[PDB]
Amino acid sequence: PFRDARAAPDPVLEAGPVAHGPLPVPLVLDNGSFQVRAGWACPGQDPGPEPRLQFRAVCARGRGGARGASGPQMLRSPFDRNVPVNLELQELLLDYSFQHLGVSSQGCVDHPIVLTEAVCNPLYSRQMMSELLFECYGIPKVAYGIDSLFSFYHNKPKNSMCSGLIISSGYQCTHVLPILEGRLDAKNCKRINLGGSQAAGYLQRLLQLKYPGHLAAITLSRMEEILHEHSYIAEDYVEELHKWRCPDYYENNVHKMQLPFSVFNLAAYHQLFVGTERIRAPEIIFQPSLIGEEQAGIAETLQYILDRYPKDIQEMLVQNVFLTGGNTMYPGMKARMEKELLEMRPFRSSFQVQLASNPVLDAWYGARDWALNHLDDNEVWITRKEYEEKGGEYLKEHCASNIYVPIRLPKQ
Amino acid sequence: KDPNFVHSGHGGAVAGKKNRTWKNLKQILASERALPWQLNDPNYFSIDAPPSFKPAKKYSDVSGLLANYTDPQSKLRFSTIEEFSYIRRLPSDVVTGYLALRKATSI
Amino acid sequence: ETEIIEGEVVEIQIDRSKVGKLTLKTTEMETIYDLGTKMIESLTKDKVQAGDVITIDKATGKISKLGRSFTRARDTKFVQCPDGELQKRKEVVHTVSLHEIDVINSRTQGFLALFSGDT
Amino acid sequence: TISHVIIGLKTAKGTKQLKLDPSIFESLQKERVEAGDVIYIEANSGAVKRQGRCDTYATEFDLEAEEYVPLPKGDVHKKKEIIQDVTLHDLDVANARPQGGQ
Amino acid sequence: RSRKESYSIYVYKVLKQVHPDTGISSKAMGIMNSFVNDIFERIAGEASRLAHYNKRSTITSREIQTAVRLLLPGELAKHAVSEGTKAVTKYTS
Amino acid sequence: GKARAKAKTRSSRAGLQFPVGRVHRLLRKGNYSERVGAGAPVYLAAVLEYLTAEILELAGNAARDNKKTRIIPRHLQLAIRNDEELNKLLGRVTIAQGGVLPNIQAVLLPK
Amino acid sequence: DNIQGITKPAIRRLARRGGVKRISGLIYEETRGVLKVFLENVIRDAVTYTEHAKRKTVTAMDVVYALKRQGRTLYGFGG
Numbered sequence A: 001p002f003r004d005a006r007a008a009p010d011p012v013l014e015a016g017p018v019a020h021g022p023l024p025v026p027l028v029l030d031n032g033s034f035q036v037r038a039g040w041a042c043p044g045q046d047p048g049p050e051p052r053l054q055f056r057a058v059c060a061r062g063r064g065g066a067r068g069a070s071g072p073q074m075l076r077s078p079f080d081r082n083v084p085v086n087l088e089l090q091e092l093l094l095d096y097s098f099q100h101l102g103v104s105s106q107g108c109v110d111h112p113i114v115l116t117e118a119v120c121n122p123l124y125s126r127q128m129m130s131e132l133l134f135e136c137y138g139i140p141k142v143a144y145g146i147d148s149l150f151s152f153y154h155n156k157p158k159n160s161m162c163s164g165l166i167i168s169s170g171y172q173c174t175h176v177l178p179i180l181e182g183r184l185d186a187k188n189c190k191r192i193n194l195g196g197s198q199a200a201g202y203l204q205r206l207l208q209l210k211y212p213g214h215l216a217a218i219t220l221s222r223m224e225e226i227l228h229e230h231s232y233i234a235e236d237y238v239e240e241l242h243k244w245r246c247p248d249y250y251e252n253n254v255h256k257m258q259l260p261f262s263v264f265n266l267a268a269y270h271q272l273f274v275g276t277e278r279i280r281a282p283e284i285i286f287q288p289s290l291i292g293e294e295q296a297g298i299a300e301t302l303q304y305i306l307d308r309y310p311k312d313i314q315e316m317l318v319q320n321v322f323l324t325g326g327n328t329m330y331p332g333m334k335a336r337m338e339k340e341l342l343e344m345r346p347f348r349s350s351f352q353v354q355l356a357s358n359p360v361l362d363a364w365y366g367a368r369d370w371a372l373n374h375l376d377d378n379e380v381w382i383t384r385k386e387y388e389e390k391g392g393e394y395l396k397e398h399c400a401s402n403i404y405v406p407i408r409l410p411k412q
Numbered sequence B: 001k002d003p004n005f006v007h008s009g010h011g012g013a014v015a016g017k018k019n020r021t022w023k024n025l026k027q028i029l030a031s032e033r034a035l036p037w038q039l040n041d042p043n044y045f046s047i048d049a050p051p052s053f054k055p056a057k058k059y060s061d062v063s064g065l066l067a068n069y070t071d072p073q074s075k076l077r078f079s080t081i082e083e084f085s086y087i088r089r090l091p092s093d094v095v096t097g098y099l100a101l102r103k104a105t106s107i
Numbered sequence C: 001e002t003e004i005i006e007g008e009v010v011e012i013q014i015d016r017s018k019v020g021k022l023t024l025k026t027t028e029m030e031t032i033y034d035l036g037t038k039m040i041e042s043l044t045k046d047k048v049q050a051g052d053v054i055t056i057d058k059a060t061g062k063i064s065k066l067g068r069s070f071t072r073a074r075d076t077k078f079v080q081c082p083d084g085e086l087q088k089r090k091e092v093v094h095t096v097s098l099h100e101i102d103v104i105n106s107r108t109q110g111f112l113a114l115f116s117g118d119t
Numbered sequence D: 001t002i003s004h005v006i007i008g009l010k011t012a013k014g015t016k017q018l019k020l021d022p023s024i025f026e027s028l029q030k031e032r033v034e035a036g037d038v039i040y041i042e043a044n045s046g047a048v049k050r051q052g053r054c055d056t057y058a059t060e061f062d063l064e065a066e067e068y069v070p071l072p073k074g075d076v077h078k079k080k081e082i083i084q085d086v087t088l089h090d091l092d093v094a095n096a097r098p099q100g101g102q
Numbered sequence E: 001r002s003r004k005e006s007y008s009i010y011v012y013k014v015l016k017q018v019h020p021d022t023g024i025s026s027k028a029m030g031i032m033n034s035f036v037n038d039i040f041e042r043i044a045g046e047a048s049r050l051a052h053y054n055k056r057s058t059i060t061s062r063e064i065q066t067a068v069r070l071l072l073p074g075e076l077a078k079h080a081v082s083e084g085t086k087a088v089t090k091y092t093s
Numbered sequence F: 001g002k003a004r005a006k007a008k009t010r011s012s013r014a015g016l017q018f019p020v021g022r023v024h025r026l027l028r029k030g031n032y033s034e035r036v037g038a039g040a041p042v043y044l045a046a047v048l049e050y051l052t053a054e055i056l057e058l059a060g061n062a063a064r065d066n067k068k069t070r071i072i073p074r075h076l077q078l079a080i081r082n083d084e085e086l087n088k089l090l091g092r093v094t095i096a097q098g099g100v101l102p103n104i105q106a107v108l109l110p111k
Numbered sequence G: 001d002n003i004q005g006i007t008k009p010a011i012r013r014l015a016r017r018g019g020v021k022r023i024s025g026l027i028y029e030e031t032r033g034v035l036k037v038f039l040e041n042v043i044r045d046a047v048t049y050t051e052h053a054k055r056k057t058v059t060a061m062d063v064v065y066a067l068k069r070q071g072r073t074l075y076g077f078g079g
Ligand SMILES: Nc1ncnc2c1ncn2[C@@H]1O[C@H](COP(=O)(O)OP(=O)(O)O)[C@@H](O)[C@H]1O
Pocket: A031, A032, A033, A034, A035, A147, A169, A170, A171, A172, A195, A196, A197, A200, A227, A228, A229, A325, A326, A327, A329, A330, A360
């Protein structure tokens, strides 16, 4: 049987929250093309006390100006392939988050934020982000970062120089990130344009084409639900689909989906037999050829990036391979990744593949931990005054962040 | 009740007749390409995966199994006899939907 | 085990490496095929026209035509179109004499002396 | 012109590289072995046996004269200790008349 | 002087794609000119009339495609539709 | 102002041969509608390409069997009238100096 | 099967309007062919016009436009 979601959250509090400790209490605003994760830093305790505002990153204003439905409740999104591009909707989403976040005493900002950004950002869009952040809120200082790198920082034993590969899988894109001694090398770094949203759309299209009768009975919500629970990645795709060819055992492990009920009354309210689509959806990232778009795929991308390195430095970076993101939640992803890595590694070589404790939420935990240990570091954050002396597209070049190139954006 | 009441536009379409929200992502990248990027300078262009040199397998469009045949009448692929009967029994709507799913020479 | 492609050919098209395309047809299915360079020669050596029931060994490339179908007879063994799937995984049993094995290993082409008695 | 040829072997247990003298390269060229075939090599004897193209290229063409085999599930490098027996009469017969070399 | 204009140097240029060693007489050139501009006028007028019927201002790819569907009798219609769709798809990309 | 020297034509970008620019000009000047779309001339050129290719292929095939190396109106006439689709597309047209297809009714044939 | 809905007396009536005295008995089966073919062209256009307007209902003006393109004009139906 299907299940549904909820709504009407109560994320409120007093004017604001300060616990006994230090003067500054920064904010964590982990972004996301799918959903936004927020919550106060809460210094003084390593475990996350109470993350708040776990809502889909979808907003919609009233057609006639009645009200702005921005939180959980057509629809619009501020993101355009993992990079935000909407201005007004981004402002209203931020206003919703701040209003539920406890604006202290009047118009202004509370404390520095540790908002995260895509792996690579065009040097026009971070300018708009900074402008609509400062000139609309006036934060004293803001620091950027990457959610996957923050997750690895949280999962790393301690803050030190580390190297390896980071496998990120999100809503609109996936990334293979080579980090070297705690410094990301954004030169031979690659991404795959396909993500979980495209997989869900593919599964939707397949199920609509399989049952032309009730096309509107199933929607994006049910597709996401089944892709989130009734699916897994295969150790070897061709051999698995060959094994699921015999009829006696094909039905032994098939899943029944009971749609709304009141032919034996099982045509409109069918059972929606799925025994192959539960594997064709997860393997989209591994095999982009399943869609008309042609690309290398996760198996060949990291090969293309790994064969341009000398044998000496390959050993320790392969020794630390990490799986992060949203799509890295299907069971058996670790086995598939380690087998694919074993196929391409030397005969006697060694490797280690690690999966995060919470692949979707460790990004926020890592951002919180990084912000907790860098409040006093005045060389990392971007001061409010610096936005006028600096062109517009300035970065700190700190760890867990992008790379800065010397350039100025002409504009007037 | 709000952080600021003097919010100013950042290049909207209030005056002109352009997109109200912002410039398109394609336009954004086209404008960003005009920057004098250095030869070794990173950007948003040299971050996409290269095209695969490995031939791509063929899979049944109705059952997701290893295909070994085709069909000149519809230009699809199946695996067994019942798959052939089913695909012949299907109308043109599902056929063109399957063709457009994995995009082909047919729109 | 062997892979066998048996069926009636409908149309052959070879361009001017070379690109080839042909459509096989049994009584229960049809299938188009793109030919590699080797198959181009394997089909040009043994002139194959429309309405010919042919059997092909996939692992080798041998064309063994059985006859022509009645459909194209209008305008030399007349065989009907085959039945079942075009591609069959056939299990083949084979027995060989022990003296046969001994004779094969004697010369460069030891099987020749097994008929003429030259061994 | 030619001194040695570097070849790369790969199975579903690892990958290795080998250096071949021109004799072994000639043996490979005689077997009509190109890039993407499953090869068997014995270092002691210099034997070269092509076991067919790998299955991953099976989709390269719809009809190809070649036969395709799966990627081997085993070690690229195999070591064994073998003990060989040979009688004198074998040596006499082998060296008595010009060995066929065919 | 005068740009009398014509497709003479176009249909002839098409000829080499089908028969690389065939010539055209002047009268045949005039015949092909008349044929091509006649078909042009027919298709353009049909698309116009259809757009006016649907109270529209612009004659687009789909309107002229429907005009071709109306005017071309049989398999020529669907084959020309495929040819035009391929041409426009290659033009856009 | 600087512009590209010897810019590529729209016909070459479309992969066709008939002039897309001339077709667009004719559409705009023919007063078929006040505004003319972008892809319409490309589609029309493609259709004209298909028709010309078909008729010329048939005309050349007809002329080859007459042991002649040049297309004349007679070959075009033989090409059109021998194909049912082109015959019904060109039912009400007269080809100058093209003659008539040779056919004799069974009744009028001796014996 | 509905072409047989064009009964024999209906064909007789249609013939009688034309001004013919005697009707062969095998005429009907061929005449039903002509009704079968002449009607297979206007619908070809009538649906197609309908399919241009993104709508799936055959209005009374589409048939008029089809008959006009074919060369048979009729009055009284919004022509
Ligand atoms: N528990 C889960 N099981 C399966 N897929 C998930 C799960 N959680 C998230 N996803 C997938 O991950 C995607 C969201 O990725 P996300 O973490 O938002 O990346 P980012 O934060 O970079 O946008 C969604 O498309 C969703 O399909």
